[PDB]
Amino acid sequence: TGRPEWIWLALGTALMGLGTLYFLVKGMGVSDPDAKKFYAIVTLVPAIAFTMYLSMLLGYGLTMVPFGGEQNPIYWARYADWLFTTPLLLLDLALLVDADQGTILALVGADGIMIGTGLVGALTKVYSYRFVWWAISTAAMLYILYVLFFGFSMRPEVASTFKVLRNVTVVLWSAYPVVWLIGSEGAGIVPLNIETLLFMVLDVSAKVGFGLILLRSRAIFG
Amino acid sequence: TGRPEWIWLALGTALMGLGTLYFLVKGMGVSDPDAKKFYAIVTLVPAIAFTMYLSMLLGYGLTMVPFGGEQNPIYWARYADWLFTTPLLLLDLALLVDADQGTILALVGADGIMIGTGLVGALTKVYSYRFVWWAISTAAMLYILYVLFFGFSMRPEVASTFKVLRNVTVVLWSAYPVVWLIGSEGAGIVPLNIETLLFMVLDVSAKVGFGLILLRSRAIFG
Amino acid sequence: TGRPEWIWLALGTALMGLGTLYFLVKGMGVSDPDAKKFYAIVTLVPAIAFTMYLSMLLGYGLTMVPFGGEQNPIYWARYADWLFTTPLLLLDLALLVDADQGTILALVGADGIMIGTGLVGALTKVYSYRFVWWAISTAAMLYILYVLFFGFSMRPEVASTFKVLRNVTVVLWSAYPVVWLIGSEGAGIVPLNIETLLFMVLDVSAKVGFGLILLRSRAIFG
Numbered sequence: 237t238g239r240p241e242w243i244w245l246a247l248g249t250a251l252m253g254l255g256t257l258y259f260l261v262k263g264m265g266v267s268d269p270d271a272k273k274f275y276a277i278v279t280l281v282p283a284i285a286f287t288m289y290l291s292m293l294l295g296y297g298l299t300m301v302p303f304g305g306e307q308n309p310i311y312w313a314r315y316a317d318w319l320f321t322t323p324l325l326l327l328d329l330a331l332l333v334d335a336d337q338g339t340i341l342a343l344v345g346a347d348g349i350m351i352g353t354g355l356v357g358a359l360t361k362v363y364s365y366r367f368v369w370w371a372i373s374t375a376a377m378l379y380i381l382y383v384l385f386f387g388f389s390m391r392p393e394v395a396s397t398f399k400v401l402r403n404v405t406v407v408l409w410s411a412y413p414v415v416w417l418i419g420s421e422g423a424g425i426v427p428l429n430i431e432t433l434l435f436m437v438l439d440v441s442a443k444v445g446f447g448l449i450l451l452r453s454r455a456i457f458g
Numbered sequence: 459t460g461r462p463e464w465i466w467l468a469l470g471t472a473l474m475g476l477g478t479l480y481f482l483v484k485g486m487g488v489s490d491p492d493a494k495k496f497y498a499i500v501t502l503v504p505a506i507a508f509t510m511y512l513s514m515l516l517g518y519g520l521t522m523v524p525f526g527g528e529q530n531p532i533y534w535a536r537y538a539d540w541l542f543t544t545p546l547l548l549l550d551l552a553l554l555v556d557a558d559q560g561t562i563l564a565l566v567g568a569d570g571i572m573i574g575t576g577l578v579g580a581l582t583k584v585y586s587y588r589f590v591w592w593a594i595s596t597a598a599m600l601y602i603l604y605v606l607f608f609g610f611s612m613r614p615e616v617a618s619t620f621k622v623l624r625n626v627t628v629v630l631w632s633a634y635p636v637v638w639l640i641g642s643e644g645a646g647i648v649p650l651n652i653e654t655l656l657f658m659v660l661d662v663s664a665k666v667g668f669g670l671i672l673l674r675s676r677a678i679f680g
Numbered sequence: 681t682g683r684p685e686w687i688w689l690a691l692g693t694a695l696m697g698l699g700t701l702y703f704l705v706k707g708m709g710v711s712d713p714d715a716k717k718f719y720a721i722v723t724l725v726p727a728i729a730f731t732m733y734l735s736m737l738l739g740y741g742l743t744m745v746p747f748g749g750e751q752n753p754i755y756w757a758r759y760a761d762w763l764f765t766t767p768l769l770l771l772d773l774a775l776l777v778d779a780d781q782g783t784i785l786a787l788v789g790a791d792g793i794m795i796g797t798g799l800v801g802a803l804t805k806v807y808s809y810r811f812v813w814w815a816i817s818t819a820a821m822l823y824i825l826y827v828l829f830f831g832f833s834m835r836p837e838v839a840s841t842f843k844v845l846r847n848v849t850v851v852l853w854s855a856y857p858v859v860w861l862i863g864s865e866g867a868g869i870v871p872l873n874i875e876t877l878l879f880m881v882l883d884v885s886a887k888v889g890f891g892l893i894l895l896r897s898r899a900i901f902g
């Protein structure tokens with residue numbers, strides 16, 4: 237299509253789809269109940285992403301939002317994806333360290349607020365207010381990163397993989413509010429095609445890279 | 459109303475409503491925790507359907523989608539219903555065979571993708587792309603039917619009822635992508651009033667017929 | 681803003697936000713798994729409300745609905761809030777009395793129907809039909825209040841707090857259908873600024889007042 241960002245959407249669609257099939261094939265025959273949980277979640281997440289990348293590529297998950305007296309192309313389909321895939325990724329971490337239910341509920345809830353307020357900010361027509369939603373969303377993220385960092389005698393296999401995945405999460409998830417802030421949803425200092433490229437690298441890493449790391453460890457088996 | 463399909467929407471509303479009250483009255487006094495689970499789920503599903511059938515009948519859950527240079531009446535309220543009722547129906551099956559959590563998550567997730575992509579296809583304005591979403595949705599269905607068929611020492615009561623309900627599911631759920639494909643959302647070979655009739659027969663059978671079968675068995679009691 | 685109701689939206693935003701921070705600080709250091717559950721839920725609920733009150737205050741969660749040949753300002757963001765916060769409040773009650781899963785599913789499901797049909801009624805352009813949805817929603821509420829009242833050897837600490845919270849719920853939740861009926865969504869006998877004031881008092885009481893009562897009791901600790 238005309239959209240210069242189409243290539244990264246196409247590339248993203250392809251990588252999420254290939255990752256989904258890879259994880260699909262890999263989890264064939266798994267019988268341990270616990271490992272079954274992890275395979276399901278690490279397969280499901282890129283499958284969801286695949287469908288939302290495809291909707292962006294085909295133009296379905298795109299809308300125009302007026303602000304700054306301009307018509308800004310806003311890919312809303314990303315929030316539909318993240319609404320489901322970021323709590324699932326947090327579930328991966330929680331199952332790992334066998335987090336208490338109370339804590340899981342806190343994380344999932346903070347995470348819904350994070351994506352929900354990001355969506356509202358993405359769709360808000362008063363320019364100044366967009367950043368108010370960005371700030372509240374960011375606070376929710378910080379809450380999450382805090383709990384993953386200061387809320388957690390587990391087998392050394394668990395601890396070792398958790399620490400890695402936890403560091404991956406903090407680094408990758410922290411870049412999203414920055415990309416949004418500088419990209420077309422925020423200050424618009426970075427054009428949409430480079431922003432889409434950034435999100436594509438982050439998403440594949442956060443979903444497929446993260447899943448490859450998770451599924452290579454024995455911490456997932458009972 | 460003018461809509462020739464109104465009669466099947468009215469009939470559907472009436473049957474889902476009557477079924478809901480029947481199951482409501484039937485589950486009065488149930489005290490076994492396990493049977494309590496099944497009654498809740500088989501009552502809830504037609505109650506949801508009732509509300510979405512009523513919204514279609516009153517015109518609320520209907521929208522026009524441009525494609526093929528025409529204005530196509532698309533009942534979106536069906537996906538709102540199915541989004542909640544098809545995972546609940548799969549939960550009925552999973553509780554039955556006491557499925558592992560990992561597997562339940564896989565089914566619910568595949569099922570959300572199934573209905574979500576069906577909705578996107580239903581609302582897509584580029585005619586060709588509608589069938590791409592139909593295909594992805596169909597693949598998700600096939601995944602589900604596979605797991606219900608090849609992923610499952612349970613009491614012979616369980617196995618016997620499961621097998622019946624499993625065969626009911628495969629037969630009825632498999633007809634939906636065909637109806638959509640030939641009906642107004644797809645190729646438009648079948649007019650909307652006959653399509654609405656088809657979906658009404660499928661839905662009542664899949665919800666009320668299925669629930670009557672489930673609740674007649676002793677497999678639901680501990 | 682011009683909207684006379686802005687003050688109650690501002691006040692509501694402020695009270696939900698202050699309550700969220702209060703509960704946030706209060707649950708610091710909690711380590712009992714059970715109490716952890718309650719803190720999460722009573723903190724999450726006002727945090728959600730905060731974001732939806734802010735969206736109403738900034739104008740995002742407001743839409744105009746034609747009916748009675750007028751353009752009626754409808755705050756849809758309330759249903760987005762209630763969709764998540766009313767089942768969470770019911771979860772508080774269920775955890776308390778250690779309700780069976782079957783029953784929890786029934787309550788959450790009835791509750792989704794309650795808010796979902798209230799939303800449909802809120803957005804319905806045929807005046808007469810709005811009250812049909814109000815009636816179905818009200819029936820769902822009555823179902824819920826029934827189960828909380830007639831569906832429940834627990835420690836006397838549990839029973840004592842449950843009874844209080846149960847009476848709070850019945851009184852406060854019962855006022856919502858009345859406010860809606862007499863307010864701008866229904867008969868329009870009460871102007872929108874007084875209606876917003878009513879909902880603000882109900883919401884803070886149902887979320888912050890309710891949470892303060894819940895967290896003062898020892899029934900929440902194992």
Ligand SMILES: CC(C)CCCCCCCCCCCC[C@H](C)CCCCCCCC(C)C
Pocket residue numbers: 251254255258436437440441444445446448
């Ligand atoms: C066999 C294994 C290792 C995995 C196969 C699954 C295939 C799909 C995608 C593989 C790539 C992901 C690796 C994670 C890390 C990265 C930072 C990815 C950034 C993406 C950019 C494009 C790079 C090239 C690729 C096409 C693999």
Ligand SMILES: CC(C)CCCCCCCCCCCC[C@H](C)CCCCCCCC(C)C
Pocket residue numbers: 473476477480658659662663666667668670
């Ligand atoms: C007492 C029992 C058996 C159930 C009572 C609940 C009432 C509601 C609906 C009953 C019908 C459902 C039977 C399932 C099978 C079918 C294939 C249904 C197809 C629907 C078409 C209309 C048929 C007539 C009816 C009004 C029952």
Ligand SMILES: CC(C)CCCCCCCCCCCC[C@H](C)CCCCCCCC(C)C
Pocket residue numbers: 695698699702880881884885888889890892
């Ligand atoms: C320290 C404790 C008690 C709580 C602090 C949290 C602060 C936030 C809100 C506190 C108010 C809620 C009490 C519940 C009961 C009421 C009926 C509230 C009705 C609201 C109307 C405004 C009243 C004044 C207030 C600003 C507290």
Ligand SMILES: *C/C=C(C)/C=C/C=C(C)/C=C/C1=C(C)CCCC1(C)C
Pocket residue numbers: 318321322325350351353354355369370371373374375377409410412413416438439442443
């Ligand atoms: C699968 C993709 C992942 C892991 C996406 C993560 C996304 C975030 C952490 C997004 C965060 C945001 C905020 C903190 C600020 C507002 C905007 C968002 C939604 C981009």
Ligand SMILES: *C/C=C(C)/C=C/C=C(C)/C=C/C1=C(C)CCCC1(C)C
Pocket residue numbers: 540543544547572573575576577591592593595596597599631632634635638660661664665
């Ligand atoms: C309560 C009703 C039930 C059991 C509905 C089942 C619906 C399906 C299995 C729908 C499947 C679809 C696809 C496989 C293809 C695309 C279109 C759908 C959504 C009709």
Ligand SMILES: *C/C=C(C)/C=C/C=C(C)/C=C/C1=C(C)CCCC1(C)C
Pocket residue numbers: 762765766769794795797798799813814815817818819821853854856857860882883886887
């Ligand atoms: C956090 C706020 C709470 C506890 C809100 C409770 C809301 C209700 C009980 C709403 C009920 C409604 C009906 C019974 C009738 C139709 C309209 C509603 C949605 C206001």
